[PDB]
Every structure is written in structure tokens, then in C-alpha cells.
Amino acid sequence: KGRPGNF
Amino acid sequence: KGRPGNF
Amino acid sequence: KGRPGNF
Amino acid sequence: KGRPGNF
Amino acid sequence: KGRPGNF
Amino acid sequence: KGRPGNF
Amino acid sequence: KGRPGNF
Amino acid sequence: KGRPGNF
Amino acid sequence: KGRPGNF
Amino acid sequence: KGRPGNF
Amino acid sequence: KGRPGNF
Amino acid sequence: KGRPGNF
Amino acid sequence: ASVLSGGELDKWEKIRLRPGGKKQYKLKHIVWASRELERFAVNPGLLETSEGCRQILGQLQPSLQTGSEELRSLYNTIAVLYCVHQRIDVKDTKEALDKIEEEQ
Amino acid sequence: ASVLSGGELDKWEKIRLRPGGKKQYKLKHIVWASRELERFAVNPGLLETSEGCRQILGQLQPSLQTGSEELRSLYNTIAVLYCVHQRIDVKDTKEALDKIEEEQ
Amino acid sequence: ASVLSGGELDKWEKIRLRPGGKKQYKLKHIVWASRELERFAVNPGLLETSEGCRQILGQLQPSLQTGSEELRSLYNTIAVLYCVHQRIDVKDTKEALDKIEEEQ
Amino acid sequence: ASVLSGGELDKWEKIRLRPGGKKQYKLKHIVWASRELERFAVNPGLLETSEGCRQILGQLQPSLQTGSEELRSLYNTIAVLYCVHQRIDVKDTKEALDKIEEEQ
Amino acid sequence: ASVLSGGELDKWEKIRLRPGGKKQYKLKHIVWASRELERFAVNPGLLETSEGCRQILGQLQPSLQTGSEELRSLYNTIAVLYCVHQRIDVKDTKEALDKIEEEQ
Amino acid sequence: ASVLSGGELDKWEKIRLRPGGKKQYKLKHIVWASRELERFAVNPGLLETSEGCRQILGQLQPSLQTGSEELRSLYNTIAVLYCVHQRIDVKDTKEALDKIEEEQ
Amino acid sequence: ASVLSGGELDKWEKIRLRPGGKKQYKLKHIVWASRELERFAVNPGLLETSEGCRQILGQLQPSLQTGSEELRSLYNTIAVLYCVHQRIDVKDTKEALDKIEEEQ
Amino acid sequence: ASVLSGGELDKWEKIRLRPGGKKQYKLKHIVWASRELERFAVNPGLLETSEGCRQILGQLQPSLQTGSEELRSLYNTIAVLYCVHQRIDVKDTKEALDKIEEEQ
Amino acid sequence: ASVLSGGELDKWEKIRLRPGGKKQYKLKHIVWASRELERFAVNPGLLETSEGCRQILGQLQPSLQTGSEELRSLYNTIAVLYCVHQRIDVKDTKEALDKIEEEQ
Amino acid sequence: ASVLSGGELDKWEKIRLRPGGKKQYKLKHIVWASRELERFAVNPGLLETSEGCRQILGQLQPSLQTGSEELRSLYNTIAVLYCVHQRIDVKDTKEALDKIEEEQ
Amino acid sequence: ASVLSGGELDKWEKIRLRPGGKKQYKLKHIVWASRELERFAVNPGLLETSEGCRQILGQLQPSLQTGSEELRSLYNTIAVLYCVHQRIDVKDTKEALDKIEEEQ
Amino acid sequence: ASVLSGGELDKWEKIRLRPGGKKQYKLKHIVWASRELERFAVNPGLLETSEGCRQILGQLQPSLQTGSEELRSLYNTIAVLYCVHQRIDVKDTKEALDKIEEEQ
């Protein structure tokens, strides 16, 4: 997908 | 002629 | 014509 | 679709 | 005719 | 041309 | 698309 | 033409 | 063209 | 000649 | 030459 | 030419 | 390009020439009047307004006392046309003339 | 259907056009005057009475100052015809004009 | 036998019909005016003097309010010819009319 | 996509170019005016409202004193179109100009 | 991995959609609600607790006034699911909504 | 099943997108707006009343500050449609926006 | 012989035409503006300095109220070019116009 | 149909373009000026009088500050032509401009 | 057309996703964030300025309490990008969030 | 062995001969000026310093009142070269002359 | 393109070079003087006016004390030409010089 | 026809060009000076007297400050020739210049 593991 | 008998 | 020399 | 007639 | 456009 | 004689 | 150039 | 959609 | 070098 | 049109 | 004997 | 080195 | 509308023409054709007479006015009498005004070098476009008719009458009036049959006929026709443009329900030329005289 | 009677015509033909002149008036000058009045749209029947002649003169008079040869000739002819209808024994047009001016 | 001299004609031809217009006056407009005055039975010889032009104007003036295109054209032409005979350096008919109105 | 409605166009076509003239206004004069405003880079859409006509007139007015025949013709046409949009029953361009001058 | 236990589901299936209606709620309505919350990008895991249901309702509420049929259906379904998690023995959606409104 | 009547549509098509522009509004812009409101899950039936348009505007307004081209286009279209339903004779989108801002 | 340096051009190309829009300015818009100023007979060499841009704007400004699309486009382009020569970090034409209006 | 007489043209041809220059004025410069005034839609007939030249100058003057080479050339040519019509014995364009500035 | 310069990108790639983690940020996370903002119909051009990032954060913030993994990831990415545009030497997302919270 | 550096030459070539003109200065004008000063037996090496340019100007100045085109051209060229050596950002010869006159 | 008119040339040719001499002035002496002034880089167009002759004399005068035969011949020729332009009926160069000295 | 006598020439040839130099003056330097004075249009016969040399020096002196190599060489040669005619036993050009400066 592309979303970061920010949280 | 065409004039009326107005008078 | 017919006019007189009146004047 | 699946939505209920709630309203 | 001959009349001017004066007016 | 088309312009009127307005003036 | 269809959107107007409103803005 | 070339004019921008500025306005 | 025809314009003078006035200026 | 070469002189400019300065004046 | 052309100059006058003025003086 | 002929000019002196005066200066 | 008649001077009158169809409704004012339908008024006009009813008006009778003489107070007790059988003879009605007709459109040709307006046509003749418009064709006669250019003999006097009056502007025929004034026939289209009540103010223009009043002005033509005011210009013709001093010539009536010695005026020919054609001038009297033109004056009476323009008086009636003035009354039609005022939409006064005059029935004859003498009514039209009295209506105009009352303004004096 | 002449304007004058035979007796007034026998007066008229004697009158001379110019005060010192040899030329007499003629009937054709009355005919011409009656034929000219319809150009001005004046009622030619007024020529038959002294009052009608006075009225025609009063209507023509303001146009004299700039008037053409035809208008001056018509005015002078109607002045003389007025004097004939008054049965004034004028001998020339200048007498006729003085006779009318005296009334003013 | 033109009304104007060659010098006053050389003034006349310069004058333009309308204040902003391109069209000049021409000699034929004087010819037409002289040929039109005999319809009104005005004496055309008055066109030769500034006083005669003033008199013709004074006689035509009351007919302007209802006057036809021909009467308005004749009045404006005779106004300009009056200004030329006064040798006023008017440039257009509206200048000529203002110059004459100032005298009133 | 004419500027006028059919009713205001039926008013417009009646109006005459000169106060005593025979020549009427026509639709092509509106077309020409709309085609001329884009030379001055004025927005031709302002011709559709009485306020827009008043604004165009206010912008053209200072150029009249030295203005060419085309600018004077355009100014007078837009004055008449302003009067038509105000639905003032003006009969000629001079009436239209007086009506607008009265507002000043 | 249903949101409800078998006992609360046996409560849920009894509840009827409209106060006088014959139609019961079904499990698929919970499935649809959980599948719809991800369109609004709301966290679907909040459906598992009464506090989460209260939070989803508090976030959806201001959109109801103009809300589509899908938003109103989702709001009413989550209101009923909140009442089931509170184990309030509501019998219909209007009871569920009144129960929640009483808290305000 | 258009949102507008034929008369209000004949008003709508005249309105131009930009205050000085040549481009008019079209029916397809209303169709697009009605098709876009269902992305935001706003009830498209509110477009049929002036109160509904005011409500949609009040809901879209806080998203304008950061809003995309599509949201700004939808907001301006619904502002103009509100003005058409109020039958305010606005001529452009900036007039429509000023008319709505005056209410605040 | 571009009006801008490569650094100011690299600023210019970033600026977007409308505050929320996707469309950037391009060099051809400066070329068009320089080619349009010679229609108004404005000196195109003034585009090279911030003072010259301020002077062109001061001369174009009174024509905006009725100005065509081309005049409004030229005014907005020269406003943005003035802001680039002042090296104000404006992001859109409305920012550029507000920056210039603040000076008044 | 030259603007100048042969005597004023014999003055004109002597005047030099620049105060120290060798180049004289020529008739073609008047022809060009008369052909250029119709681009600005100024009435070219005003070139024929000293008052008209003063009026054209008063209309061109506010455009000089940003004016193109063609506008500055036209302004200076019309200044010199004004001085020739005043028959001031100016020798160059700078003398002509000083003579006109002294009037302010 | 990346949002960051090469120098700010060389800062960005150093920042680690979690305070103790091994995983760095990458350019694709900015690409994904710019591609995700158009789902919320937020203007993606605001990512280019620190003020735009602050505005996007202020608009996303009230949705965090119930926000999905994608909304929390987008909020944290835009917080870090705001810190990079402020050129604050933050080392992780929790530092970035504390830096932004300190402003409140 | 040019008088100017490449940077001051890149200033010089931009300067235009006449305040509104299209024609730029060129290097050949400096070459011609340096070749002309040896006719007057002035030391051409003074062109290399601002003080030398001021001295040449002070020596040429009293000959200007009657000076030929070549002397006026040389004086104006050396004035501009003085301004370039002072690195004053003059745009034309008249600016250069005003800048020098202000020192008096 | 002689400096003198034919009448002033007919004065000039009478003047004799020396007070008691037989030798007259000739046109070629004016031609030579005009061809010599360009050696001194004086503007030869000043020979056309009495003020220009006075200015040339005022510029040549300080060089007389040590002046060559050519400078003295040019000074005396321009003195006589000044007297001819003043139309003073001088008969010889010594008269011309006394006439000019009297002005000091 | 040398300027000097054989005795003063036998003085002249001894004088050295520079105060410490080996190079003597020569007759050709006087010949060159006499041939150069006619470029400046100075009367070369003044070289024959001490008063004439003083006058030539007084005329050349103001041109020295900017003077070319040829003018400085001519001035120094005529200074030395003045000292020879005064029969001052100067040994070099600097002595000659000091001797002349002492007179000031």
C-alpha cells in the first residue's frame, strides 16, 4: 500500500 | 381625389 | 404667362 | 445493498 | 435630388 | 460599413 | 469531467 | 491565443 | 514606416 | 561612421 | 583655396 | 614622427 | 405602416363625417391627409402622436379663415385624428372640433 | 361667371397698370389672379366681395416684404379689384394702394 | 451668375455639413437652395446680400418647429450663407446657427 | 442572442436617427456598436443592462470633444440603447441625449 | 469475530426496525455498518464497546441534519448497538434514540 | 426531474461563471453538483429549496479554507443556485457570493 | 532577452493562476503581455523594472471597471510581474493583488 | 488638400528634428501624423487649426509618461505643427515644446 | 516536482518512524500522503509550505480521536513534514508531535 | 584592452540611447569616442577613470553651446561612461545627464 | 540652400574686402566660411541667424590674439555676415567690425 | 629661415631633454613644433619673439591638464625656446619650466 508505521 | 366631405 | 406688370 | 430501513 | 444633409 | 448617421 | 471554472 | 486565465 | 526621429 | 544618435 | 583677403 | 621626449 | 393601430383604426372607421350623416371615415382619408401635408411642407411624422397633431393644428389654424376646401378638410381630419389619439370617444367631426375648442 | 359685372368690368378695363403708363388692365389679369390664389390655397370665392378682397389682402400682406414678382403682382391686382368693388374711382395701382393704406 | 464671389466660394467649399463630419459643402447646395426658395414664393435675389439672407431666415423661422427635412435643410444652408456673407469664419452648420442665435 | 427583447426591439426600430429625419434605427446598428466596443477594449456584455450602458457612456464621454465620427456614432447609439433599457419613450437621438443630460 | 456475543445477538435479532413494524434487525445490518464506517474513515474497532459506540455517535451526529439515507441508517444502527451494549431492553429504534437522547 | 423550473433555468443559463467572462452556466453544472454532493454524503434533495441550499452551504463552508478545486466549484455552484431560488437577479458568481455574505 | 532573470523566472513559473488552482504561470504569459502592451501603445520596456510595472498598472487601472477579458488578464499578469520584481513571495494572483492594494 | 499652405509648408520644411541636427522636417511627417491620429480615433480634421492642435495635444499629453516611440513622435510633430499655425518662428522641436510649455 | 528540496529530503530520510526504531522515513511516504489528501478532498498544494501543513493539521486534528490507521499515519506524516519545513532538527515522530504540541 | 570590464560592459550594453527608444548602446560607441578624443588632442587614457571622465567633460562643456553633432554625441557618450564608472544605475542618456547636472 | 536670400546676397556682393579696396565680397567666401567652421567643430547652421553669428563670433574671439590668417579671415567674414543679417548698411569689413565693437 | 640665430642655435643644441638625460635638443624639434602649431591654428610667426612664445604658452596652458603627449611636448619645446630667446642659461626642460613658473 505505502502508508508508514508512524503510530 | 380622396378628400373627405368633412366640412 | 399672364401676370400684369403691376409693380 | 444491505442497509436497514431504520429511518 | 440635391439637398444637403445639414440637419 | 454599418455605422448610423446619428450625429 | 464536468465541474465549472467557478473560482 | 496565449492569454492566461488570471481572472 | 514614416515616423520622424523627433524625440 | 560610428557615432551614436545620443542627442 | 578660397579665403578672402579680409585682414 | 619628430616629437621630442620632453615630458 | 399605418398611423393608427388596429384598435384605434376600429374606432376611427366608426366615426361619421357629418353629425347627422350616414358616411363613415375611412383609412384612405388618413392616407390622403398624410399625402396632403407634404404640399404645405409640414412634417408628416407628427401625425403619429397627439402632440404632433396638436402642433399641426396650431400651424394650420390661422389659414382657416380664408382656407380652401382642401385645407378645411385636412384641418378637420387632423382634428379627428387628434381626438382618436387622445382616445376621446367623439362620434363626429363637430364633436371633435368642440372637444378641441374646449381646450382653448 | 366673371367676378365683375359688365359695368364694373367697364370700369376695370380703363384702369392703367402704372401711374404714367399706357398699358390698361384686362380681364385676363383677373383670370390669372383667380388661378394663382389656388396655389396659395386661398379660397378664390372671396374675390367676389369687397370684404373677401380685404381678407385676402390681409393674409397676403406679411409676405410682401420678401415676396416674389408673382406675389406682388397678385397683391396689387387684388388691391385694384377691392377698389373696384368699393367703386372708388381710382385711376392706377398707386392710387388703389394709397386708398387702401388710408384705411390703416 | 453665382451668388458668391470666387473668394467667398473658396471659403464656402471648406465648410463641413456636420460638426464632426467629413462631408463639405458644395456649390450645388447653393444652386438647390436658390431653386427651392421659388417653391415658397420667396424672392431668390435676397440670397445675394447679408440683409436678404437675414430676411429669408426671419421668414422661414416660424415654420421650423413642424418643418420638413427640405425646410430644415434650406434654413441651415441659408444660415451658413448668411455667415459667409458676414465673412464670419464659421467651420460648421452648428457654429453658423450659434453665431446667428447670439444676435437674438 | 440579441441585446434587446422582441418588444424593446419593436420600440428600437421605431426610433429615428435625426429629429426631423425619415431614417429609422435598425438592428444592424446594435450589431455594429457591439462589434465596435471591442476595438476600444470595452466589455460588450455591459450593453445588456441600463447600468452597463451608463458605465460605457461614462467611459466614452471624455473622448467626445475630439472624437471621430465612429466614436460619436457609438456614443449616440449607446445613449439611445440606454433610453430603450430605461424604457423612456424617446423619439430621436436628441431626445435621448437630453434625457441623459437631465440626469447630470 | 462478530461484534456481539451470542446472547447479545439473541437480544439484537429480536429488535424491530420500526416501532410498529414486522421487520427485525439481522446480523447483516451490523456487518454493513462495520463495512460502512471505513468509508467515513472511522475506526471500526470502536463498535466493540459502549464507549466506542458513544464516540462514533458523537462524531456522526452533526452530519445528520443534511445526512443521506446511508448516514441516517448507520447512525440509527449504531444507536441500537449502543443500547444493546448498555443492555438496555429497548424494543425499537425510536426507543433506542429516546434512551440516548435522555442522556443529553 | 431537473432541480430548476424552465423559467429559473432560463435565468440560470444567462449567469456567467466569472465576473468579466464570456462563459455561461449550463444545466450540466447542476447535474455535476447533484452528482458530487453524494460523495460528501450530503442529501442531494436539499438542492430543491432555498433553505436546503442554505443548509448545504452552511455545512460546506468550514471546509473551504483548505478545500480542493472540486469543493470550491461545488460551493460556488450551490451559492448561485441559492440565489436563483431566492430569485435574486445576480449576474455572476461574485455577485452571488456577495449577496450571500451580506446575510451574515 | 527575457524580462526576468533565470532566478526570478524560477520564482515566476511556481506561481499559480488561481488561488486554489493547479495551473501555473508560464513564460509565454510574459511574452503575450509584452505583445499586448503594444496594442495599447504602452512602452513595453517598462516591464523590466518594478517602477515601470507600477506605472503601467497606474495607467491601466481606470479601464478595469469596464475592461475586457484581455485587459483584466494583462492587468493581473503585470501585477504578478511587479510582485516578482519586488521579490515578494506571493503564491497567487489574489495575493499579488492584495499586496499591491495594501500600498494604496 | 495638405494641412499647411505653401507658405507655412515653406516654413515647416526648414524646421529641424533635433536641436543640433542636420535632418529637416518633411511633408510626409504631416501625412504620417494624419494617418496615425485615426489609430487613436482622434478626429484628424483638428490638425487644420491651432485650436485643434492644442486640443489634440491636451488629449495626448497624459499618455506621454508611458508612451511608445510612435506616441512621442506624434506628440512632438503636432507640437511643431501647432507652433507653425501660431506662426511662431521656432527652429527645432525643443523650441516648439518650450514655447508650448510656457503657456502652461 | 517533489515537495521537499534535496537538502530537506536529505534531512527527511534520516528521521525514523518510531522513537527507538530502525526504520527510516522515505520519499514514498510523502508521495502516499499527497495521494491520500485527495481522498479527504484537502488541497494537496498546502503540503508545500509550513503554513499549509499547519492548516492541514488543524483540519485533520478533530478526526484523530476516532481516526483510522490511515488518518493517524497521515496526521503523523504531515506533522513530521511541518517540522522539516520549520527546519526543526527533530529525530522521530514523537519529537515532531511534542514540538507541535508545545505551540498550543 | 577595452575601457570597461566585462561586468560594466554588461551594464553599458543595456543602456538605451534615447529615453523612450529601442536602440541600445554598443561597444563600438566607446571605440568611436576613444578614436574621436584624439581629434581634439585630449588624452584618451582619461576615459579609464571616473575622475578622467569628469575632467574630459569639464573640458568639452564650454564648446557645447555651439557644438556640432559629433561634439554633442561625444559629450553624451562620455557622460554615460562616467555614470557607468560611478556605477550609477542610469537607464538612458537623459538620466545620465541629470545625474551629472545634480553634482553642479 | 545658400545662407543668404537673393536680396541679402545682392547686398553682400557689394561689400568690399578692404576699406579703400577694389575687391568685392563673393558667395564663395560664404561657402569657404561654412566649410571652415567644421574644422573648428562649430555648428555651421548658426550662420543662418544673426544670433548664431553673434554666438560664433563670441566663441572665436578669444583665439584672435594669436590667430592664424585663416581664423582672422573667418572671424571677419562672419562679422560681415552678422552685419548683413542685421541689415546694417556697412560698406567694408572695418565698418562691420566697428559696428560690432560698438555693441560691447 | 630658421627661428634661431646660429648663436642661439648653438645654445639650443646643448640643452638636454630630461634633467639627467643624455639626449640633446635638435633643430628638427623646432621644425616639428612650427609644423604642429598650424594644427592648433596658432600663428607660427610668434615663435620668432619672446613675447610671441609667451603668448603661445599662455594659450596652450589651459589644455595641459588633459593634454595629449603631442601637446605636452609642444608646450615644453616652446617653453625652452622662450628661455633661449630670453637667453636664460637653462640646462634642461625642468629648469626652463621653473624659470617660467617663477614669473607667475
Author numbering:
A (entry chain L), B (entry chain T), C (entry chain V), D (entry chain H), E (entry chain X), F (entry chain D), ...: 10 to 16
M (entry chain S), N (entry chain U), O (entry chain W), P (entry chain C), Q (entry chain G), R (entry chain I), ...: 5 to 108
What does the paper say about this structure?
In immature virus particles, the Gag membrane-binding domain, MA, forms a hexameric protein lattice that undergoes structural transition, following cleavage, into a distinct, mature MA lattice. MA forms a trimer that interacts with membranes in a phosphatidylinositol 4,5-bisphosphate (PtdIns(4,5)P2)-dependent manner through a highly basic region (HBR) and an amino-terminal myristate moiety.
However, we previously observed that this is not the case: a Gag mutant in which cleavage between MA and CA and cleavage between CA and SP1 are blocked (MA–SP1) exhibits an immature CA lattice and a mature MA lattice, suggesting that long-range interactions may be important for MA lattice maturation. We obtained reconstructions of the MA lattice from immature (PR−) virus particles at 5.8 Å, from mature virus particles at 3.8 Å and from MA–SP1 virus particles (in which MA also adopts a mature lattice) at 3.1 Å. In the mature MA lattice, the ordered loop between α-helix 1 and α-helix 2 sits at the centre of the inter-trimer interaction, forming a 230-Å2 interface with, in particular, α-helix 4 in its two-fold-related neighbour and a 90-Å2 interface including the 310 helix of another MA molecule. The loop between α-helix 1 and α-helix 2 overlaps with the previously described HBR of MA, and the structure revealed HBR binding into an acidic surface in the adjacent trimer: the positions of residues R20, K26 and K95 allow them to form inter-trimer salt bridges with E52, E73 or E74 and E55, respectively. Sandwiched between the two-fold-related neighbours is the ligand-bound side pocket where the two symmetry-related ligand densities come into close contact, bridged by residue R22. We found that, indeed, the six sequential C-terminal residues (GRPGNF) of SP2 could be confidently fitted into the cryo-EM density in a manner consistent with reconstructions of the mature MA lattice from WT, MA–SP1 and MA–NC particles. In the resulting model, bound SP2 adopted a largely extended conformation, with G11 at the top close to the viral membrane, and the C-terminal F16 at the base. The peptide is held in place by multiple interactions, including π-stacking between the backbone amides of SP2 R12 and P13 with MA W36 and H33, respectively, and a salt bridge between SP2 R12 and MA E73. A cleft consisting of residues L21, Y29, S77, T81 and T97 supports the binding of SP2 residues G14 and N15. SP2 seems to contribute to formation of the inter-trimer interactions in the mature MA lattice through a salt bridge between the C-terminal carbonyl and R22 in the two-fold-related MA molecule.
